[PDB]
Design a protein around this ligand. Sequence first.
Ligand SMILES: Nc1ncnc2c1ncn2[C@@H]1O[C@H](CSCC[C@H](N)C(=O)O)[C@@H](O)[C@H]1O
Ligand SMILES: Nc1ncnc2c1ncn2[C@@H]1O[C@H](CSCC[C@H](N)C(=O)O)[C@@H](O)[C@H]1O
Lengths: 206, 206
Amino acid sequence: MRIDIVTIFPACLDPLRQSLPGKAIESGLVDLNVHDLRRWTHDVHHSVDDAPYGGGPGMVMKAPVWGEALDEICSSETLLIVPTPAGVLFTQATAQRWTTESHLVFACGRYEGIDQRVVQDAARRMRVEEVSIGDYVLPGGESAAVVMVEAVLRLLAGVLGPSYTRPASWRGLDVPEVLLSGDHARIAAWRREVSLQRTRERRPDL
Amino acid sequence: MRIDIVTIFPACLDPLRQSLPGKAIESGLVDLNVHDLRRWTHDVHHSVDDAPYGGGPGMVMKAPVWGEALDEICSSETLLIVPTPAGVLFTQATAQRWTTESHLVFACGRYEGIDQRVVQDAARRMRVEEVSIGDYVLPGGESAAVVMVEAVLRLLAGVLGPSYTRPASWRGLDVPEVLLSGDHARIAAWRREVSLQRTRERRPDL
Ligand SMILES: Nc1ncnc2c1ncn2[C@@H]1O[C@H](CSCC[C@H](N)C(=O)O)[C@@H](O)[C@H]1O
Ligand SMILES: Nc1ncnc2c1ncn2[C@@H]1O[C@H](CSCC[C@H](N)C(=O)O)[C@@H](O)[C@H]1O
């Protein structure tokens, strides 16, 4: 897999050089490249942003700068991912689906986001997805791209209820007898039962 | 606010030293500390993990090591956050709620997670929350803690539909006339209408 991440904060993708993703890279499973968007700017101030039409707070990332970056980095086989709290929700199904991709490009937004025409123009050449990692607002798309890449790379590396360990009794808290029993059938049943109960309490949406 | 993050991958929290969170730190809004869990180990191999009771794949993070770290770092006023895909969903309401906290501690899990008794034992002294940032599986809790801290710090710093910018026409794509009109009432109505439509298509759960 080839991954390209475009951002005005390259340092924020440094976790992808560590642990599982860093191991996936050095082992040649993935080619990861992080690009500073300012390298596609030409003005004296190397600016990636401008005032929004119709007003609003903050600034908008300019379509001409993004368009020039994506024209260079993307092909017709690329799956362009635009993190946004207005996108479809990223789930484990999405992470599994992205393992079948040859080229992922992440266009990380800052400020109020990226001029909408970047997505519409990209869609003329390649496949584009606006994706949210959850119902919260982040200052930028970088932490979202780390989350998405780690979820995909975990699956790629693997392809290519409560947990307990010793001691049996700690601070007056004992490991449930079922786990000490060595009876796989009883253990599987209990784990399913506790997971169902926890799901009912915390995640009835599931 | 004081934030403590406990992990076997301190480098993975480096994004919190950049951009908005890094600015919140240097301006004295937040005291952020990242702790390597191995510093609370005493065995020859400085190990934080052991085999799970009842079997299963991988390893479990030991309760005695976590208990010793949390005994040192936490107080009765701490809100202990344990990232887990089995927790309640983190949302913008949670991020807003956490801005009222004086001390957040994030216990980042690796492997199959943290022995469940760590949470139960912590709950004897302080408030604990098991939290998921979404319906996907990450290799570790660090990228989840970055997401949560950034969402909270964005709100803390601020307290203490589609976007467009120039040019009006780009690659044959024009900015909607409504945004060029300068009529706030018409702009607000249109933005609400396009956002509602996008919500119906992508997020009927909302
Ligand atoms: N929940 C989330 N999921 C994925 N990306 C998010 C996110 N929250 C914020 N972001 C990122 O942070 C950037 C700035 S937040 C701007 C939000 C924008 N007005 C919109 O509605 O799209 C976004 O462009 C996106 O890249
Ligand atoms: N969706 C998510 N939200 C928050 N943390 C997650 C997460 N997915 C994985 N993690 C983190 O990654 C670590 C290893 S994943 C292990 C999952 C564990 N068996 C469980 O059901 O809790 C978890 O301990 C947690 O810290």
